[PDB]
Structure 1
Amino acid sequence: VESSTDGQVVPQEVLNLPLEKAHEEADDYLDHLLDSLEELSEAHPDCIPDVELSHGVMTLEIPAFGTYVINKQPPNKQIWLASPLSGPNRFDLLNGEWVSLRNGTKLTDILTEEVEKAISK
């Protein structure tokens, strides 16, 4: 912070508030997904045995197709999908939902399709 400034704001009532860092919107998504997908992991006739979430990396075992990988990524566009079925994709917010850079389809919809394509068989 080289400007030789002596003191900007400290206009306390920013700093005397119940203050809080933001939460990566990608981080937010992966949580709403971890326990929404492990609440699906209940009604598997057998065939979605595991979801695990590391450090912004999510693995999803689905033996019917092979194993999904879902990632926090540096931009150029963020959130990464590696699907054993539909291939690789990446996603950024448009209007509150996560959308493919490729064609602009929701990954929320791509998971739905592919998860319930599995409940069938």
Structure 2
Amino acid sequence: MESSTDGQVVPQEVLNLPLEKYHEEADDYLDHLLDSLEELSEAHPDCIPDVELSHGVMTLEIPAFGTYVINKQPPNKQIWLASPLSGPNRFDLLNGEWVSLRNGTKLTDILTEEVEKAISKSQ
């Protein structure tokens, strides 16, 4: 986390779907996810959490409720949210908003509400 890179294989997206926008949002989305969790687990975790970042995947281990994961490297275009147990959520991109259920629920919404009621359920 400090270096930089680039990947421009000719303006082949300008004629088709907004590929650049997809890599920009998805890149910032996953990055911001592991960035916030990393700072929260390092600044004030709880027991011994672990934030891992993979190419198109955001692993987040939580030694209290389980392990949360969020990737977007499907055979098409979606964000899989691996629950703290073993339940990936296939979220679809919505004009810049990943929601599941043909437009019903949101990722950060289910993850924030789930983790909130999962960690607060006791505290």
Change (3 A) 1:105 1:85: farther
Give the TM-score normalised by the residue count of structure 1. Answer: 0.65
Contact 1:81 1:90 in 2 (8 A): yes
Question: What's the CA shift string for 1:41-97, capped at 9, x where partnerless?
Answer: 246462461111021222111122221222122354411111025832111221321
Aligned length: 121
Matches of 1:96 and 1:16, distance apart in 2 = 17
Once the two structures are TM-superposed, the CA of residue 114 in structure 1 deviates from its matched residue by 2.7
Once the two structures are TM-superposed, the CA of residue 27 in structure 1 deviates from its matched residue by 2.1
Change (3 A) 1:119 1:24: same
Change (3 A) 1:33 1:5: closer
Once the two structures are TM-superposed, the CA of residue 108 in structure 1 deviates from its matched residue by 1.1
Once the two structures are TM-superposed, the CA of residue 117 in structure 1 deviates from its matched residue by 3.1
Matches of 1:5 and 1:17, distance apart in 2 = 23
Q: Which moved more, 1:23-32 or 1:2-11?
A: 2-11
> Could you list the runs of 4 or more consecutive aligned residues of structure 1 that deviate by over 6 angstroms after TM superposition?
1-22
Once the two structures are TM-superposed, the CA of residue 98 in structure 1 deviates from its matched residue by 0.9
RMSD over aligned Cα, in angstroms?
Answer: 9.8
More helix by share: 2
- Name structure 2 gaps, 5 residues minimum: none
- Name structure 1 gaps, 5 residues minimum: none
Change (3 A) 1:75 1:25: farther
- Tell me the equivalent position of 1:7: 7
Contact 1:52 1:58 in 2 (8 A): yes
Matches of 2:58 and 2:81, distance apart in 1 = 10
Question: What's the CA shift string for 1:9-57, capped at 9, x where partnerless?
Answer: 9999999999989735322210121112223224646246111102122
Largest Rg, 1 or 2: 1
